[PDB]
Assembly symmetry: D2
């Protein structure tokens, strides 16, 4: 009986209990939505992590680089929610860039094969998922993806940043197609969140310099954000995604909503 | 028991039953909010128009250019909602520019006294209202103002456009102050809506050329908007404002949410 | 025989030998341009300061808030460059905001009369000058104004920032009119330069907090700028203005060129 | 004795006498620069086309997707300009996207292998070229690439647009590295130019719908541009690139200069 009461939503991107996607799924269910999850390759793990969600939800395997996974995607989803039913929302919360495209490894030293894999998973997959799922979405539906403001360069993030720039551009095009189905397509630019991977990197997983740079980046965030920013709490981001999945933002598409504490609206 | 259940919200800007503000108030009340309205100078009229709202709400006079109105504002609002209570939201939906700053009258022919009056009411008042109301707002509160994308020049709108550019900049600063009170400050950029004034202008109220230019502007909107745009329906805009007044966009401030059908994300 | 060889250019904004305008005039003359200067109210001083320029140039009084000054402006300029001749360029390098609109004085405490005076001189005057001068400009001409990136809020600058937001918007409209005369209109966003006033402020002229905030702002600039930034050297900015006055940027108008060392293209 | 007198500049991208690059090379030489050209795979043709340039210039083969070409690039360039000498400028004017990523072929039907090839040549190569050439560039040097505003979606261009979004982001990062060598990195966003390929497409080479869409896009350009736009004349674009290669835009890097007639600063 909440924001998403009666909505059927597919949520990808869960890998650990610290994933933004995990918190997206929790808030969504708390708000009355029925979910259908998708996981990359460690499904046994994802399954075990997802049992902790408020309610149960079927888990479907989905390797965004696998054409067969995508081709059969809509089929398996309908099977999970039952024939005759369609999705009202889709959450894209996946991203990746080989170590070579981030951290201390110099920007120029990233081989195209690695950058291409990063863009395939981080940006193109947004279009892939929409393509596979639009056929089984209801008018008024909503697709949303996770993003971070790449309008300016920054240290460490390197090619992952370039992948976001590409993603934002793909979103604007996905909106054109999604509009034919009465569906909206938007992105959510979050502030930095301490997921497992992020912590590992801050801890020096990808080099000391990278870790040091990303650390004072997080610190400058809470300082710039007029309402502050708590990197250990992904709830404010999960709510924003749910706001976009609801019926309360019916006139916005091909857009980006910033859930970063307002940090990007301030020089300092 | 809706989006704004239990929220006390002040809504300015109602002048006719076609005002964006009127539709903001309606949706807000339908969602369980208690309102406190403010009107410019024709209160008898505003009063008569507002009786048509779902529920009743006290109407307070407020001339945004009157220092006394603003000085006593918070006092009269507390009186209306009762001592001990505070506002959880504030909607700024006022705007104005003398005929000389819009339409066929050439851009260069607008005397500064007129432009200054337009900016005083359309942009500075956003800061004025926040100043007067922040002292009586609850943490988690939300201030929202009506806006239109002025990132690019356009015919007819002339100085009103310049006033919006100023407004967007004031919003970013209001967010800095509002943040000290745990309050967010955002703007909503709407697509063109056929209010009384807009219709009059399209009908040639400010010259034939102006009317003709604004008319094909509205037409290009629905064409560019991936989800289309209905200029006669302000409901999609009212909902977006309510989304910002709710607790579902807790990490965004000093920002702009586009409720324009996605028209600004497309070249054509 | 340089960049502006044979060009007649009017340059406003000189007040001391540290003014951006002073350096604009110097580089322009070094590049073969004939100038016509305008000064605010201390002409004896301006005159004495300008004698130091490479070559001599007539000085005309111009109070941007004085309608008579503007009305007779074109007349006096033609007299100075001789009947039959027209200007090929115009440099707007003036700006002002009462103490109340900047520094430690809280944002909300700036009375509209002060903000309005600041916007009149800092933004509207851009339109005023174009209006008066376009009638006496040659096709291929170029108008340029001084600006600073106000796309994000920042401490201390307060309303002066809002005035720039307005200026950028006015520039886009001035371009529409200037285009009818075959003339371009652009702005140059400079990094912080240590003019007399800026130094005074950094020294605490408008409060200690303001001075401290602006000081670490300048420091963060050179750090973010991929090519660095030297606040004591206005030459890089003067050259950029001359680039816009030349014939080498013939397809850009209603635009903004950033001469800030590239600081705005980087988060850090 | 012109803008680039004494400058050694490498210019890639020439394929026909209608290529933007061809006009870049012409204006550059007319302004006193010594060039070193690079061509893709039809060197016999490029050679024959380039004989028509004002002066002669060595042509080096360069397949941006060939690691060997890039690895030996700097070596062959030094050989061409003679040991002891370095480049003062580099022009990246290459772009490509398989038919499947543009035109009538639906956005969702573009296989990643094709999109990846387009991004490799259109965006990543900007970084590749900088990497290979920075070691042999002089302080004060300048790298510039051709671009088109992809901030908004548009019909027909599809993935090529996404590739530009990526390119703009890569440019901001290239600037960080180039800055270490005292070198600037900028992009030039041009209005539509009737190159051979563009004409072919307008003529229906990639489908009738695509051709029709791109045709009214070009038409809307001249209408929006305050100074107009001539799609058959690439000279205004060539000059802008030369402006960036000169010493008159010393404080701008990681940026984008719009040589589009000012079309992007206007809604209509
Ligand atoms: C200064 C620069 C900056 C950076 C940020 C951020 O990085 C911030 C913004 C977006 N995001 C995005 O949020 C999404 C989820 O990431 P999380 O942080 O939750 O991390 P997780 O690693 O927990 O989860 C995401 C998913 O990646 C998935 N994976 C990889 N390849 C595939 C594939 N091929 N198919 C299917 N799944 C795959 C994986 O299985 C996993 O479930 C991504 O799109 C992110 O980029 C995360 C942020 C953070 N801080 O952790 C914010 C502000 N400024
Ligand atoms: C191509 C350019 C463009 C324009 C738009 C728009 O103009 C669109 C966007 C914002 N708005 C904003 O919405 C707000 C409300 O305007 P409405 O359209 O409802 O019109 P209304 O005239 O109905 O209502 C607004 C209020 O102005 C108030 N008024 C004037 N002076 C004062 C004062 N001094 N003190 C108190 N009240 C005063 C007046 O009393 C009235 O209630 C304003 O801030 C508008 O600019 C309206 C739009 C429209 N189409 O009608 C959208 C996209 N592109
Ligand atoms: C973090 C915020 C920020 C700020 C900046 C800047 O402030 C920077 C950018 C633009 N500018 C602009 O450059 C122009 C010239 O300012 P200067 O710095 O040279 O200062 P000056 O005070 O030397 O000169 C400008 C003129 O103001 C003129 N004046 C006032 N009123 C009038 C009037 N009514 N009629 C005629 N003249 C009048 C006055 O006579 C004087 O000649 C203005 O438009 C400025 O805002 C200056 C900067 C600086 N650092 O000094 C850059 C980056 N980030
Ligand atoms: C509404 C959308 C839109 C589009 C535009 C434009 O497309 C406009 C903007 C940039 N450009 C860019 O200008 C550059 C040059 O393109 P031209 O138009 O001259 O076309 P050309 O085809 O003449 O030349 C470019 C080069 O591509 C080169 N090529 C392909 N692969 C490789 C490779 N692997 N290695 C080396 N060379 C290769 C090829 O050899 C050729 O010399 C590119 O980066 C373009 O995208 C061209 C425009 C136009 N109208 O022709 C402008 C505004 N709005």
């Amino acid at each position: 009986a909440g924001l998403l009461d009666g909505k059927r939503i597919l949520v990808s991107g869960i890998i650990t209990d610290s994933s933004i996607a995990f918190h997206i799924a929790r808030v969504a269910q708390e708000q009355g939505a029925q979910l259908v999850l998708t996981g990359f390759d460690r499904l046994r793990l994802i399954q075990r992590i997802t049992d902790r969600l408020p309610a149960k939800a079927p888990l479907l395997e989905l390797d965004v680089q696998n054409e067969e996974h995508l081709a059969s995607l809509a089929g398996r989803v309908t099977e999970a929610i039952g024939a005759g039913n369609k999705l009202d929302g889709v959450v894209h919360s996946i991203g990746f860039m080989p170590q070579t495209g981030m951290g201390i490894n110099p920007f120029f030293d990233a081989p195209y094969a690695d950058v291409s894999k990063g863009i395939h998973i981080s940006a193109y997959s947004y279009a892939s998922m929409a393509k596979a799922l639009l056929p089984i979405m209801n008018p008024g539906g909503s697709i949303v993806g996770m993003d971070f403001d790449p309008s300016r360069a920054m240290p460490a993030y390197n090619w992952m940043t370039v992948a976001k720039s590409a993603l934002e551009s793909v979103n604007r095009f996905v909106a054109r197609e999604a509009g034919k189905y009465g569906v909206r397509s938007n992105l959510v630019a979050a502030g930095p969140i301490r997921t497992l991977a992020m912590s590992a990197i801050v801890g020096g997983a990808l080099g000391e310099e990278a870790g040091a740079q990303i650390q004072l980046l997080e610190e400058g965030w809470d300082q710039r954000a007029p309402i502050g920013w708590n990197m250990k709490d992904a709830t404010p981001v999960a709510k924003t995604v749910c706001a976009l999945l609801s019926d309360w933002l019916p006139a916005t598409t091909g857009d980006i909503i910033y859930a970063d504490g307002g940090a990007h609206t301030q020089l300092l």
